[PDB]
């Protein structure tokens, strides 16, 4: 997490970096299969180590509140 | 760094060279333009009235 930042930058900045990256690094459920093997490959790029499925998602989350709405309507 | 003597050491770049058209060492090999005769810029020869006194 933000431990790499030492005593620099202040609370807010590193609290949010840790929070965002924490969720970014969590196991993610692949949309193709259902396995929890989705990792970020870069900005907005996600991929399943299991089946190889490579797809677009949020910048730090594979799914965003807006993307979820699309499915519905 | 001193702008004088110490800055004179990096000057090993070739720019003005012997010109094919006029023979002067004014053909800028980077610009491919002679600063003396205009070769590379003008078919006509470079020349100006201010190169001599006004009434001469």
């Amino acid at each position: 997490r933000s431990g790499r930042f030492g005593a620099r930058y202040g609370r807010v900045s590193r609290r949010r970096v840790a929070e965002i990256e924490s969720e970014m690094n969590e196991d993610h459920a692949c949309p193709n299969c259902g396995e929890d093997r989705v990792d970020r490959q870069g900005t907005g790029i996600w991929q399943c180590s299991y089946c190889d499925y490579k797809f677009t998602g949020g910048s730090y989350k594979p799914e965003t509140p807006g993307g979820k709405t699309v499915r519905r309507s | 760094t001193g702008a004088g003597t110490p800055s004179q050491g990096k000057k090993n770049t070739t720019t003005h060279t012997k010109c094919r058209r006029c023979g002067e060492k004014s053909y800028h090999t980077k610009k491919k333009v002679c600063s003396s005769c205009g070769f590379g810029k003008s078919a006509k020869r470079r020349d100006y009235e201010w190169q001599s006194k006004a009434g001469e």
Binding site: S13, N32, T43, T56, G58, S59, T64 | -
Partner: protein, 237 residues
């Protein structure tokens, strides 16, 4: 005095240009004779250096291979379609007329066939509200209600990469790296920190603007600085 920075910009010198030669593709909707039969398969997902957002590589039936402005939720293997009869699923592109009202859309054309102009940045989207035989009313990400020819093509879904703005840059160096990929001069020296000769706010024994910051719309370049034709300022009220 001297020309102000905003004036140096227009000359288009290296310092102010975008590193175009380093960009990948000019994202635009494909041209279809008609019929809509045009479909392709997503072959890969790449990073777009000009938008800090993902983009999708697609192989179309008629052999054409082009990068596409990727909405969220598109992956390798998916089949996208472009045309009047395109199915109504994310990643497909069709005229606002064939799109069901109430659906989120991106890369909307301003004029039919221009290839897409609105809602293209990370995570944004337009909202098709009203239909008609003459006008298609769309709500852009800025919140504005835009009247568009229903013939204007668009892509179903919200643009990929949403949430990019949620993370702080934290350090100067990170901004630096991003700025290097844009047509922008950075960092930014405050006008009030300059000399009178260099900026209308320059000069003085201490730092403060000389006059009020709200400048008229009619001000000439070199003088139009600060709060341009501000209808109001501050937060109060």
């Amino acid at each position: 005095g001297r020309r102000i920075q905003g004036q140096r910009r227009g000359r288009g010198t290296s310092t102010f240009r975008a590193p175009s030669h380093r960009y990948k593709a000019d994202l635009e909707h494909r041209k279809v004779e008609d019929g809509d039969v045009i479909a392709g398969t997503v072959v890969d997902i790449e990073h777009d250096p000009a938008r800090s957002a993902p983009v999708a590589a697609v192989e179309f039936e008629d052999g054409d291979r082009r990068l596409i402005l990727a909405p969220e939720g598109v992956g390798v293997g998916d089949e996208l379609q472009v045309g009047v009869s395109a199915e109504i699923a994310p990643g497909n592109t069709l005229p606002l007329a064939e799109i069901p009202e109430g659906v989120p859309v991106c890369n909307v054309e301003s004029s039919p066939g221009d290839g897409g102009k609105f809602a293209r940045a990370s995570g944004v989207n337009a909202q098709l509200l009203t239909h008609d035989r003459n006008v298609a009313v769309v709500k852009l990400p800025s919140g504005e209600m835009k009247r568009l020819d229903p013939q204007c093509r668009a892509t179903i879904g919200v643009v990929a990469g949403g949430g990019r703005t949620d993370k702080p840059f934290v350090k100067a160096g990170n901004k630096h790296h991003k700025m290097k990929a844009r047509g922008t001069k950075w960092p930014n020296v405050r006008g009030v920190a300059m000399n009178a000769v260099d900026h209308p706010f320059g000069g003085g024994g201490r730092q403060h603007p000389g006059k009020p910051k709200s400048i008229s719309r009619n001000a000439p370049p070199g003088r139009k600085v600060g709060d341009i034709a501000s209808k109001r300022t501050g937060r109060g009220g």
